[PDB]
Amino acid sequence: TRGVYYPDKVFRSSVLHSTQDLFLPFFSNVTWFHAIHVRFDNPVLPFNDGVYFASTEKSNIIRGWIFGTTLDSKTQSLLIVNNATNVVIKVCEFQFCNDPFLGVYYHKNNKSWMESEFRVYSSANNCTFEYVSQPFLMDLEGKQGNFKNLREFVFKNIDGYFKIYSKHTPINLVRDLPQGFSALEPLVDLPIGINITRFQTLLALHRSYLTPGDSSSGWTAGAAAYYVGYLQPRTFLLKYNENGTITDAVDCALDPLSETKCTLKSFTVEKGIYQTSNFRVQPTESIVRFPNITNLCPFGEVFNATRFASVYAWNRKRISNCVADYSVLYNSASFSTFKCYGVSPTKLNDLCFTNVYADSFVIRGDEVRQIAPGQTGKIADYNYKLPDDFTGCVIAWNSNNLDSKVGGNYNYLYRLFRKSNLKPFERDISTEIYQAGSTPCNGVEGFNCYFPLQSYGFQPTNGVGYQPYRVVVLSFELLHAPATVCGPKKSTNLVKNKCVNFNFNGLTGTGVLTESNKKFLPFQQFGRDIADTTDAVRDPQTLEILDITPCSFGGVSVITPGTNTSNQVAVLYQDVNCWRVYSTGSNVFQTRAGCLIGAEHVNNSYECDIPIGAGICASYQT
Amino acid sequence: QVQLQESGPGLVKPSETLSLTCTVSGGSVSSGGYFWSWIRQPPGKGLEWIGCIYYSGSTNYNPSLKSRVTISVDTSKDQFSLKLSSVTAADTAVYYCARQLWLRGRFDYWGQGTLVTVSSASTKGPSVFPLAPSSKSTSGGTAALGCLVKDYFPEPVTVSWNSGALTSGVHTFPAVLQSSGLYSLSSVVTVPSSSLGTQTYICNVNHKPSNTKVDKKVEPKSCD
Amino acid sequence: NFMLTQPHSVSESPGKTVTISCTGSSGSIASNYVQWYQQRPGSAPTTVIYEDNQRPSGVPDRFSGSIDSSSNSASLTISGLKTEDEADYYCQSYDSSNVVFGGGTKLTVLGQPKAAPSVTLFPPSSEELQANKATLVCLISDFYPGAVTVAWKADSSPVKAGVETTTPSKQSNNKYAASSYLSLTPEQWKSHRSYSCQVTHEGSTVEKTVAPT
Amino acid sequence: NFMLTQPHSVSESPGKTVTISCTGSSGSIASNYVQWYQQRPGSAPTTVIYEDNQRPSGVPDRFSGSIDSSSNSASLTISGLKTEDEADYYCQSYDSSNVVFGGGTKLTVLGQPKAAPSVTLFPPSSEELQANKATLVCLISDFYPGAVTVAWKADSSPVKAGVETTTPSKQSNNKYAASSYLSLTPEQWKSHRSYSCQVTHEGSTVEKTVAPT
Ligand SMILES: *[C@@H]1O[C@H](CO)[C@@H](O)[C@H](O)[C@H]1NC(C)=O
DSSP states (O other): OOSOBOSOOOOOSSEEEEEEEEEOOTTOOOEEEEEOOOOOOOOEEEOSSEEEEEEEESSOOOOEEEEESSSSSSSOEEEEEEOSSOEEEEEEOOOEEEEEEEEEEEOSSSOOEEEEEEEEESOOSOEEEEEEOOOOOOOOOOOSSOOOEEEEEEEEEETTEEEEEEEEEEOOOSSSOOOSOOOBEEEEEEOOOOOOOEEEEEOEEEEOTTSOSOTTTSOBOOSEEEEEOOOEEEEEEEEEOTTSOEEEEEESSSOHHHHHHHHHTSSOOOSEEEOOOSSOOOOOOEEEEOOOOOOBOTHHHHTTOSSOOOSSSOEEEEEOSEEOOGGGTTTOSOOSOOOOBSSOGGGTTTOOBSEEEEEEEEEOGGGTTSOSSSOOSSSTTTTOOOOTTOOEEEEEEEOSSSSOOTTOOOOOEEEOOOSSOOOTTOOOOOOOOEEOSSSOOSSOOSTTEEOSEEEOOOOTTSOGGGSOEEEEEEEEEOOSSOOSEEOSOOOOOOOOSSEEEEEETTEEEEEEEEEOOOOOOSSOOEEEOTTOOEEEEOOTTTTOOEEEEOSOOSOEEEEEOOSSSOSOOEEEESSOOOOOSSOOOSOOEEETTEEEESOOOOSOOOOOSEEEETTEEEOOOO | OOEEEOOSOSEEOTTSOEEEEEEEESSOSSTTOOEEEEEEEOTTSOOEEEEEEOSSSOEEEOGGGTTSBOOEEETTTTEEEEEEOSOOGGGOEEEEEEEESSTTSOOOEEBOOEEEEEOSSOOBOOEEEEEOOOGGGBOSSEEEEEEEEEEEBSSOOEEEETTTTBOTTEEEEEEEEOSSSOEEEEEEEEEEGGGSSSSOEEEEEEETTTTEEEEEEEOOOOOO | OOOEEOOSEEEOOTTSEEEEEEEESSSOSSSSOOEEEEEOTTSOOEEEEETTTBOOTTOOTTEEEEEETTTTEEEEEEESOOGGGOSEEEEEEEETTEEEOBOOEEEEOOOOOOOOOEEEEEOOOTTTTTTTOEEEEEEEEEESSSOOEEEEEESSSEEOTTEEEOOOEEOTTSOEEEEEEEEEOHHHHHHSSOEEEEEEETTEEEEEEEOOO | OOOEEOOSEEEEOTTSOEEEEEEESSSOSSSSOOOEEEEOTTSOOEEEEBTTTBOOTTOOTTEEOOEETTTTEEEEEEOSOOGGGOEEEEEOOEETTEEOOOOOEEEEEOOOOOOOOEEEEEOOOTTTTTTTOEEEEEEEEEESSOOOEEEEEESSSEEOTTEEEOOOEEOTTSOEEEEEEEEEOHHHHHHSSOEEEEEEETTEEEEEEEOOO
């Protein structure tokens, strides 16, 4: 119920939206650090994905933190120090000391505090980003009472963007971390653009006349404490109210009680049987794998050929063994038709095809509108028919500088007459004279006997509807075969035995990557089981077969006797014969429907209130 | 997600230069190869498309408004702007900036509609006039009071009651054209008559183009 | 020279279907796709139907679209109308180095009972006496329908010069609000004995008067 | 706003029917009337069909017409085409006390001897010598395909600056005529030894040369 912030800037009101971001796990075993004069503990904590800094302040002890990789003037590091005058944020190669501290001196003659020692960094060589805030005055006084202010900070380092969420909440607890819920909001975004893996807290050092000795021993430590958390990426539900502030949150990985709210998308859970998931690990990284034939596809020649074939004989070229960069295809701003049936041009950079076929011919303006799947005319019926389930689209543009000469260009011949309707993706080259009446037409060209091929009149001053338009037809095929032609997307490294969502040759799913000993035929690419789910992956970058282990595989039934009624729930495992369970718990009972934990068993026989299965009934009693 | 927020003055003199800067936050202008464009619409009329840009310097313009637009991309500030020259009186319109997922695709994400008006008059400060309630200003067991905004131009003022603490019964009347050029509106609230001389109702009037923030209190009318 | 033509205003009764047609002028409509937008007043337009009939997330299933190359028109069909469907509708297509739009089809749909026209006035207080201005404000709120006539009345003759009024606008509680302002000089405001704003609503004229005190 | 839309150019083979459609933008086409006009180039337009079904005296019976109010479009059907039918076509209307015309449909109608491209040249005579100008004229006549590849070849290098040419135009004897002019200073014309105008016609280049004498 702590560390919850706004993961997006989109305003939501009375809508529960599931988020997958770096969030603080519920009831985590966070580390506790204490600094009591009576313990100046300033360790270096690892920065895996994010650290939630929980600390309560009563005398302005904690000032800032040091962020970097090595902190030895060898890599780029981020400095955050909150002095008594201004706030200094710099990105330089600082040489940080072993135990950095800020020294504040106190005078017996006059009750005033003034920082005197600044021992944080030795020197800075090269600086990239520097931030200076407005000046302000802080009293920097010591309090003999209990804690008053609590400061919460969330650190995130994604794609070089440093987002810090802070919130001030007044508390009166002495030592224990306060409970309840808080909402955190961004205040500034820092484009540091560096890799940070280690960090250390920077406190304030107080000196006065009550601590005799040298500089290294003559000092006292203020009464302060802080806690260090970890941001594990887990799915969460956040309750966005009408004011835009999150008043409560729902976990999906702490307990089966929490995950029941996650599946139902509601904060209140009534009585019933719910199936959320088995023992489930939230995904942390993401992987994409595509074939690595980094070769440009040759459609730049088909779109720029020196000459184009006729309509009755359209040249078709197979495109394969290359990556198809469609960014130079739908962004040319020089074509005239891009109605793409089925798939969308925005998804052409993601999908993978078995092979790409590119037809080509030249057509007039009036017949460029009738090359859709369901259409009729003298072209779609006799010359070029697309299937009703056609994938891909035609591309046409004006051809007046080329293929347009005075006196008429009669080189092309379209099929004006034909005996029957044309089958889809069929090319007809036949010059036999078509007859109409019962008179024989054995090669004659008399009455009721016309040449099936009619020439075209292409003049530079002809009408726009009769201008010759160069038409190229891209067709995509999806067959049970490895995809030799894919989008220009790259491929990351391959991970194993970890619940990681994957992107294999255009197929996206979440699971655990495990080695498979099954022998896979070269014709097939994907393996499907009886349940019709993905089981085998070819992985064309390495050409090895991996078995997809589901992250959740067993059946879990959560016996929840309401939310306000009781906070105790029972977990029933269907595939477990009482381990791969959420928790061991107590009162483990094995029934015919499976293994039930968290619920007691009695030898009596009462009325069935909450059925379990196979005659087993459970109820909430005293 | 990503969103677009417009900026720039809404008061332009005719036959002058227009400067609107659409800033995109939550994303990258150069990354993705997305087409940024501008769309305008006269009040009560249809939408008009101005021009489109790429992440490079390639620009496309509407033939009707050619030789008057110059859009540029500032990748360092992650924004794309527009430059209109020789602005006419018919150019008063709501201007939009919209990302395109595809060159001939949908304008999927839009920015908020900014008002740009072509007028020779300069921005003038508003006059906040309190409306003192009296015995003749009450109709029944409830009383009405408000603040009158007069002699202001051109963008409507944001009127709030007690720094937004009072919202029930607040009726912000739309502004109308005055006798000579200027505009005037009002924002009143209906309250019980027993809370006239006990609760102090203070109106907050803020004028964006004139940068004027006048805080005026409302008191019951006293006979003099 | 490509432009899109659609009817200026098409209205229909709730519960039935309505067809909005967008027709190209010169070029074909079967190329470079089409896009449909709905612009709520005082807000940016939002995409409703893109591509042939594709629909983005957040749009109800009632919005159906189809194309017709033979008629050279694009059709958007709405079934099961609602109050929230009352907005301007636009059709958008692409041409050579330019994007075209339409005139904008204004769809209108459609309970509301009669309301008593409460009248409030405010005489010019002492703040404007030193500013050499005097404004009398007439308040007309909670009335039905939005058609009232404001007639300022002085002690001697009705006032018409310097009279400005606000057109009725929708209120929060399913009603209408309006206002009227009378700009006067401070000298003529104190000279007249009293000022009354007579507003006639549904035949009845509710009048409240104020005096310079 | 009421505007009439028609196709920019519709062409068809002779001997078969052709349909020209004029479509209104917003208002209905059944209201008022539509008038069809045929404008021969270099002449005033003449009435062809008036009052949507009637033909004036002097117009052939081939010009038929019908009105489809459901499709909101007019029609003009021509059967049995001819060379004289090659002209611009327009549609008239009257809405909101305003006569509205159309963009203009250009109807082009779809054995010619191969004539020898005779070439004639004329040196600048003594009349322009005292006027400080010199113009060389190239004359091309009696050619079926357009002789536009005109090259002004001097004694040393071909001349391109100051070169103007005329587009081919119809002659009286079913042929084409063209011309080319070369404006030069008198010093430039006298300095060069000879001037020749090379015109490439159907592959062949017929060149006539002249010299300052
Ligand atoms: C064809 O050539 C032109 C000019 O060189 C070029 O702009 C265009 O991108 C080429 N087409 C393709 C598909 O690359």
